[PDB]
């Protein structure tokens, strides 16, 4: 292990409690000490990974299994159809256009021709008439984007260049004259950009200098008459709703704002699903933790009415007006999707299609479309684009495109969902994928994946490297739908957040205990993986129950829960976590904060034969979301407390970091992605002493 | 819009 300087003078007083930060110097990513740190840890990692002889075998199988063509879900503008495409191993998906659903595709923009496909397309948007394509190019490694606009007729660029855009989409008016977008000044703003003008002419619609940290999303209605501006606060599922009637502007948008403020608080979420003149149908979680659909008239905006009420059990994950006068509701029922087709006017149920284990999504049909497309995926189903023509054949879902994994027989494997009890009795859904008819004899290596926060739902989608693990490592895979997610509505979220963050970790620990006892695996043959808030999950679990795990892999995780709020955009996670600026909330955090809870388990009575599992910490060096100091300071702490602080430490399992050079948190090239996963699976194979097949 | 389902 390389030497790592400690700074024994850094100490802070959080409400009477002294907390030392000996590795505070790693928070400057540019100091040569930090750069050398990284360089050494890299050196160490490679050294260890050279020992992991299965990496090259995994890598090939992952490549071979990923190498199949992939059509994305098509959407329509005027009489053209756009969609993403990958031949199989292209670094980034290519955006394409066609006149006929089965006519010759044409390439519209190809990210792989730019910086060798380091970044793909994050923001993409086609005008109503299908003549213009506004898309977002990442300039450097940063999150910042430049909006450009191509004519689709000849793939030529307009001179228009819009800088200082991050996550905004580009929302086209139906006159095709311009779009709304949400940039930052050189304090987010809402602007309107006219085609053929300089950005300096763009119209202002909203700012609130008094509330710099409020951010925005926006949208236009299918009839083109109203512009909605949504205002958010942090990552809480809640928002304001302001509406602008475009039909009533003396001089179009060139006048310039007078918004109808239909919702002026952060009490609840609201997403416009459809409207008939001034009569909106919204999706909301107001007095409904699973959501519901409600209807209001803007000309009498005090009076709201249930259209489709809240379900007692199932989450209304999303809703989409289709085929002029119908609704497609996407319900999440015990972590399995269910599609309902209903009448828009009355909200009455017309058809109901439960979906197999897996995930549907990407329903991008609009209200004036009669054919709906969506994507189904699953652990053993790589990707199918289904279509439903609601006009001429409403009952039947037909296959439109279907991915095939080369040399893979899905019938050898199966997927169950079981429910397991957590410490506090709450049942926790988990998926379990393995070979058919294995012995529950405790032998099998076992990978377990989770997240547990921010309302995010973990569906069991397709991973190619998972198959490799399953087939060629005789493995058992488990995805855990622990609390903090949104799987069962907002109470499921809140039951694993702020003061109840600990329930998330107990839920995960409990799933692992089930897997041990049921006979799938054994203590120390269990691997855990998670990224971001899931990395925090991995890191707190190995602090708390190192005895349970053989290997742990924490990707770009949040580890110093005392100081996360101070960097980049960590200040918008205090909704979920808390802030250490408030004593009550500091007392939650200090208990699970991964860097402040690294202890030698062998010094606990009865727990002498125990150590930390083999641990790999993955992060980019230029990660703008979860700043990599988190990952480093933990790595530093773990190495010291467990290894370098002692003459001959019982900690024999390696503790390393795989540091990705010249990459970001976002959008990763296919081969970069494979390189990492191949690394983390070879490591895992060695930590679990698991043989290849 | 992730490049591959790895
Ligand atoms: C990963 O989980 C990291 C670390 C803690 C939470 N988090 C996030 O990435 C959060 C959670 C899901 C989305 N997210 C996020 O970064 O988006 C916040 C946001 C940024 C800018 C504008 C609007 C929202
Ligand atoms: Ca071991």
Notable traits:
heterodimer; A: 693 residues; alpha+beta; Rossmann fold; Methylamine Dehydrogenase, Chain H; 2 domains; 8-stranded mixed β-sheet; 5-stranded antiparallel β-sheet; 31% strand; globular; B: 6 residues; little secondary structure; binds N-benzyloxycarbonyl-L-prolyl-L-prolinal; binds calcium ion; Presegetalin A1 (chain B)
Please give the radius of gyration of chain B in angstroms.
Answer: 5 Å
Number of helices of chain B: 0
Q: In CATH, what is the homologous superfamily of the largest domain in chain A?
A: Alpha/Beta hydrolase fold, catalytic domain
Main β-sheet of chain A: number of strands, strand sense, barrel status? 8 strands, mixed
**Helix percentage range of chain A:** 10-25%
Q: Which sequence of strands runs across the widest sheet of chain A?
A: 33-34-36-35-37-38-39-40
Oligomer: heterodimer
The coarse overall form of chain B would be elongated
- Extended strand count of chain B: 0
The percentage of residues in β strands of chain A lies in 25-35%
Number of helices of chain A: 9
**Radius of gyration of chain A from CA coordinates:** 26 Å
Instruction: Compute the number of structural domains of chain A.
Output: 2
Biggest interface, chains and residues, is: A-B, 31 and 6 residues
* Total count of strands of chain A: 40
Strand content of chain B: under 5%
| CATH architecture designation of the largest domain in chain A | 3-Layer(aba) Sandwich
CATH topology of the largest domain in chain A: Rossmann fold
